[PDB]
Design a protein around this ligand. Structure first.
Ligand SMILES: NC(=O)c1ccc[n+]([C@@H]2O[C@H](COP(=O)([O-])OP(=O)(O)OC[C@H]3O[C@@H](n4cnc5c(N)ncnc54)[C@H](O)[C@@H]3O)[C@@H](O)[C@H]2O)c1
Ligand SMILES: NC(=O)c1ccc[n+]([C@@H]2O[C@H](COP(=O)([O-])OP(=O)(O)OC[C@H]3O[C@@H](n4cnc5c(N)ncnc54)[C@H](O)[C@@H]3O)[C@@H](O)[C@H]2O)c1
Ligand SMILES: NC(=O)c1ccc[n+]([C@@H]2O[C@H](COP(=O)([O-])OP(=O)(O)OC[C@H]3O[C@@H](n4cnc5c(N)ncnc54)[C@H](O)[C@@H]3O)[C@@H](O)[C@H]2O)c1
Ligand SMILES: NC(=O)c1ccc[n+]([C@@H]2O[C@H](COP(=O)([O-])OP(=O)(O)OC[C@H]3O[C@@H](n4cnc5c(N)ncnc54)[C@H](O)[C@@H]3O)[C@@H](O)[C@H]2O)c1
Ligand SMILES: O=c1[nH]cnc2c1ncn2[C@@H]1O[C@H](COP(=O)(O)O)[C@@H](O)[C@H]1O
Ligand SMILES: O=c1[nH]cnc2c1ncn2[C@@H]1O[C@H](COP(=O)(O)O)[C@@H](O)[C@H]1O
Ligand SMILES: O=c1[nH]cnc2c1ncn2[C@@H]1O[C@H](COP(=O)(O)O)[C@@H](O)[C@H]1O
Ligand SMILES: O=c1[nH]cnc2c1ncn2[C@@H]1O[C@H](COP(=O)(O)O)[C@@H](O)[C@H]1O
Lengths: 367, 367, 367, 367
């Protein structure tokens, strides 16, 4: 007999401290398989499944056609940003949809016609209807309603309109952090939910508006509620490391969306420049004054260091996730989440001293 | 009559905050002996006892033959690293085993033939069997199975193989942080356990894989479980100070293993170099890309400032431990641990403000 | 009717978090007197009362005869350090005892013969008996047994010896942080207690030996126990501000001892020097290698910025204490402590965010 | 070393469950004296001390002159009831004051003239002033203001009047169960307090008026507050056993007042009668309709079984108290209370199952 060690997820979130990724760890389990055996199949919506849980964010410094093609080939997907004209966006979607490899990718995301999957973002205003018919003529597969606070009559009306006019189109609902928000969007009829508010690397929404939630708590609560109706959720924002990806998936998320991790890659839109002897690319929030152009800024504009190509960077992330799952003792992401919900998966909190101990420390210097 | 002050260890760990060394202190007791009377005899395995609780880590920038000889003479032991050919490792072990002082050390670690004790690390792959054969012909005394997560079918199979083929060899099992992990390795038949995951100074395992545990909690829990079967545990990683050594021993550990504290000594492998006007030596994790050579890095590579010789540095550590035990009121490490388990030893938590108050503060400058 | 706000001291310390001065505040009360009316009379020992609660520390960079004379004139007292020959120490005490003002100070500390009060420190070894003989012929008024851990057979034996040979001499017992330590020294027969271990500005005892206690908790617990026997306690170490003085007095201390606050004044021993364009004086712990001269260092050696004269600095401290007492609504320190013990005085905890809010913030620059 | 067992009184009352005598026990201590050595000296008021803690209640079926003489001879005291004419009451007091033994009692309660001590009860109306002067002419020693709720302007005015006109007379203030009630009466100037409301054996005040407090909690809280001003308190009502007496004294009471325990003794007023083959005496509350004669009844009227003489019954109670103190390890009642306040005395709660286990159980029959 062995006494139990650590906390279940339900106990971990019972004290209501406002935890996020860096505040806890996952305890190791039992290893009886190799890391290359770990299955990463994940549900994007009610009806779309991917071989990898990685999604590119619809930001104008992250995802255009080249990014989307690379993500689809690597086994994820990309959502084209809509900070542009509808004709431009539809042309980007068409470029993705008509790509042909030579004119090996065993994990590529494909539709029935064997074309690459693609997604796009739209707003909740009247002209977005015209945007929408253009995008559907270009052959989009899935739509995300792009908003900081999706629990509104505007977004609900847009969801109803889409469901009426295109009964085949998959729709992902706007950003939520509570079950009460999730309920209205699920009743309106969304096939997926985007979770997170204020946690993004370029975000200042929390400081400016006082509204948001710690991302780990938000992911756990919303996923726990949404699984009751078979609705998968995307964990969006605040991902800085492979460990963060693993933690988000273990807390209930089906997929993970990244802006800053994938910025400054070759496929990202924009030009490379130099400063202080380092190669850089621009990365900015959609709510920064540069992107929008009295108007209130909800994001900043900055730069990221070059990371190389997506087709090199993504396999590193996949291998990291598989090794994390092996250390946990889970041979697939479905098994990981079922162990979490049954209480078999165990967690531990970290003090600030523990977090310092977890990083590099006590060295004169290092690279 | 006096009311009780402070917390017992069991109460200290009851709230499950995820404590490590810097998060608490030990309250003083009653002094009726001098510091030079404090006995530091400690059990390395079921059948090997040392006169000092200090062990050198099997890393390729820490322990080769010179380090191992120095540690054995000072009253500890060293484990030769296996990031090298089996012939090279066996030659290192032979060099340690055939050393003769002149061809005083009252605390030296010796075997029956009166030769210095030595240890070595091996992996869990097929060629490690041949490594084992060579090391056993060189006369090793104890083996550590070297792994980040020892609770696996591979390590269990290797333990069974070693027990079958060399019934006399002492084996220390791979790194664990939970009682459930400890149970499988103890059932397989290990004579000792290495405890710690993610806490090392050169480690990034926690950030990359999301898996680990705060080291103080891990030491307390695993030692409390393992004492039931008479299995001693080594506290491995995260030791930066003599106070950390004392805390680890008071929490239940029998010995303490150090990588970075003993790096940049004369006996450490490698060459001294200069930079920015300071003499330095390389110190790197075994999971860094330099050591291993898609592959995922689990450690970094850095440098440490010169510390002088082991035969000067270790007596400083011994005297520090003895003075800590005197302030606690414990005349031996066995007495210290029995006071801990009986509840006589008392602890107190530290806020961050308390930790700041505990260090140097309020000075213009100091050296 | 008004509901109660805040915590009593007993509730504040019930959760056992390990609080220091910076972790809490005192809530304001009702003002019906001016700040100049606040009485600061305080008990140094069972039989010595001072008009001010301020004491100079027996360190070789803080208190010699000039410091002691200034402190006595301002209404406190100084303890001569014993890092010197007994003849030198006795000469210092004689210089203090024979001082005559002109060869106004309404608060000066005097004895029956109308000479200034003086104190001295001694150790617990055999030659300290001869030191004691010389100091008593020089006319000392009070002795502090100087040790990091006073709960020992050595200190108890020295207390018994002093009580037997000089039944008139007042003795203050070595540094303690628990009631169990306090009990033995009180049974041996001390007239006062020095409280604090590891909290001093130049101290590294906690990091090196793992032994100590947060100073606010230590003061509250030891004073609560010691008042039962009519033994006053000195709060020693970790005082950086007037607010810290006020907090220590409100938690139960009768007097406060300062090393670093009074260092780099004109009366402090040593010479002024310049570096980087600032005038400085040396300030070092008695356990640093410079002071002691294998030996283990328990303190560091540094420098402090010039503060001017004691006869200017101390009145600033007195006025600060009086204004704090006025804001609290206490017209004397005895009344302050009685309000604390009755539960009328109320406290509140501070998060780290609250502590940041409490300091200077949100400025481009300031002086 | 031994861990602490049980709860201190402060911890016992921290959960606010509303405990009374039967809800807890006292844990045994260490015996190093015989039961006959136990000192039972107790303070009745600021200025009257008795050799025994037992008081007779001022009820018209309990205390008249014969009861008062017997109690004084046995070492307690009796308060004459005032449900009668002032001339009758004064005659009773005169009878007590002029008694002479023969016209051995080593514990008898005496005044300076060597006459037996006596007490009397008065109300808070205008004619009570005339009652009071008559009683003072008869030579009363102490007065209790007799009321169910003493925290009123009427009782405060009567206390002021008594203090003005008879500065030598000791006054005990009306029944209270809270510190807020106690404060007003202490400010008015009482020398003692009567504690208890609704707990008496013949009382229905709680059922009729919804106002009261469990007696054990009331005794602890009021005594803890009143000791700060040197005011002793009487525990009044709800005493059925010697164990209850011991518990009340251990919780802080200085004396204990009994109505029903002393009813149906030879000295009690009234006539013996028979019914159903048992000898009985009447015992009724002062608030029952029979005693008062729309009027609301606050007590009932009943009967008690004959107990014999006071001079036999009281020594049994004294011996029981002494044996309880011996089992506790307290050689006097002052020592018992000091052990309680220091935390050395330890208590334990009882479930209902534990209370059943504590009585007689599992027998066919018994006598
Ligand atoms: N996830 C986050 O925390 C976060 C925070 C800030 C910004 N962002 C991103 O930046 C961009 C800005 O988002 P946003 O919320 O400011 O844009 P939005 O268009 O959703 O909201 C702007 C404002 O217009 C209002 N509005 C929207 N549709 C309306 C309609 N049909 N009729 C009337 N009023 C209407 C909204 O209620 C809101 O006050 C998006 O790409 C968003 O995803 C995200
Ligand atoms: N203590 C720590 O937290 C920590 C963390 C990282 C690395 N390290 C150290 O760095 C080095 C690297 O350790 P590691 O765990 O990466 O090495 P490892 O060889 O134990 O593990 C590497 C991978 O190979 C697999 N593997 C091992 N033996 C196998 C077998 N027989 N058949 C199939 N698969 C097998 C493992 O399951 C794992 O996925 C070691 O020296 C280790 O001690 C320590
Ligand atoms: N308050 C603090 O936290 C703190 C910490 C470190 C140093 N200090 C100060 O620095 C100085 C050094 O203090 P310390 O405790 O190192 O000095 P100490 O002389 O009290 O202790 C030194 C060592 O000698 C031992 N010792 C003392 N008297 C002895 C005797 N008669 N026989 C045998 N052994 C004996 C002690 O037990 C201890 O191991 C003092 O001035 C002290 O106040 C204070
Ligand atoms: N201890 C108990 O729980 C308890 C309960 C009920 C009765 N008793 C006893 O029974 C008897 C009845 O007590 P009681 O409280 O009913 O009697 P009381 O005379 O104290 O009170 C009767 C009523 O008269 C009022 N009153 C008293 N003095 C007054 C004044 N000067 N002017 C105006 N109003 C005035 C009171 O406020 C109350 O409403 C007493 O002997 C008492 O000790 C005790
Ligand atoms: O301007 C902005 N203000 C606040 N949040 C934004 C903004 N732009 C994008 N976001 C969110 O931040 C996410 C990316 O955050 P990151 O991965 O942490 O860089 C996006 O997917 C959006 O949900
Ligand atoms: O590359 C690595 N990644 C993570 N942990 C390592 C690595 N190499 C060694 N370790 C562990 O870290 C310990 C030393 O840590 P340190 O004493 O804190 O420097 C070793 O004994 C190993 O257990
Ligand atoms: O060398 C040392 N090591 C640790 N504590 C010391 C040392 N020297 C003095 N102290 C303590 O520190 C106090 C002064 O601390 P400060 O006021 O915070 O500067 C003294 O009164 C001593 O109790
Ligand atoms: O009529 C009444 N109603 C309520 N309480 C009474 C009454 N008469 C006396 N008491 C109280 O009950 C106490 C006696 O209670 P007993 O010892 O439990 O019988 C007296 O000392 C009074 O405080």
């Amino acid at each position: 007999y062995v006494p139990e060690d650590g906390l279940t997820a339900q106990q971990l979130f019972a004290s209501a401290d406002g935890l996020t990724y860096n505040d806890f760890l996952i305890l190791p389990g039992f290893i009886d398989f190799i890391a290359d055996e770990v299955d990463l199949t994940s549900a994007l919506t009610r009806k779309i499944t991917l071989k990898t849980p990685l999604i590119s964010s619809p930001m104008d410094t992250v995802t255009e056609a080249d990014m989307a093609i690379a993500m689809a080939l690597m086994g994820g997907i990309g959502f084209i940003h809509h900070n542009c004209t509808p004709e431009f966006q539809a042309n980007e979607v068409r470029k993705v949809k008509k790509f042909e490899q030579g004119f090996d990718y065993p994990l590529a995301s494909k539709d029935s016609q064997k074309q690459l999957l693609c997604g796009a973002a739209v707003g909740t205003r009247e002209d977005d209807k015209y945007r929408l018919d253009l995008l559907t003529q270009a052959g989009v597969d899935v739509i995300v309603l792009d908003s900081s606070q999706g629990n509104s009559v505007y977004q609900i009306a847009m969801v109803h309109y889409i469901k009426q006019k295109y009964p085949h189109l998959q729709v992902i609902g706007g950003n939520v952090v509570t079950a009460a928000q999730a309920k209205n969007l699920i009743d309106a009829g969304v096939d997926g939910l985007r979770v997170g508010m204020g946690c993004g690397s370029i975000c200042i929404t929390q400081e400016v508006m006082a509204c948001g939630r710690p991302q780990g708590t938000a992911v756990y609560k919303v996923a726990e509620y949404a699984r009751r109706f078979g609705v998968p959720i995307i964990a969006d924002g605040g991902i800085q490391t492979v460990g963060h990806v693993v933690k988000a998936l273990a807390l209930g998320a089906s997929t993970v969306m990244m802006g800053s991790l994938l910025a400054a890659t070759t496929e990202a839109p924009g030009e490379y420049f130099f400063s202080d002897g380092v190669r850089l690319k621009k990365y900015r929030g959609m709510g920064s004054l540069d992107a929008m152009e009295v108007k209130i800024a909800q994001g900043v504009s900055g730069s990221i260091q070059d990371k190389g190509s997506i087709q090199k960077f993504v396999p590193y992330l996949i291998a990291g996730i598989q090794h994390g799952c092996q250390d946990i003792g889970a041979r697939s992401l479905d098994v990981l989440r079922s162990m979490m919900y049954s209480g078999e998966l165990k967690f531990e909190k970290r003090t600030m001293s523990a977090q310092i101990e977890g990083g590099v420390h006590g060295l004169h210097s290092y690279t």
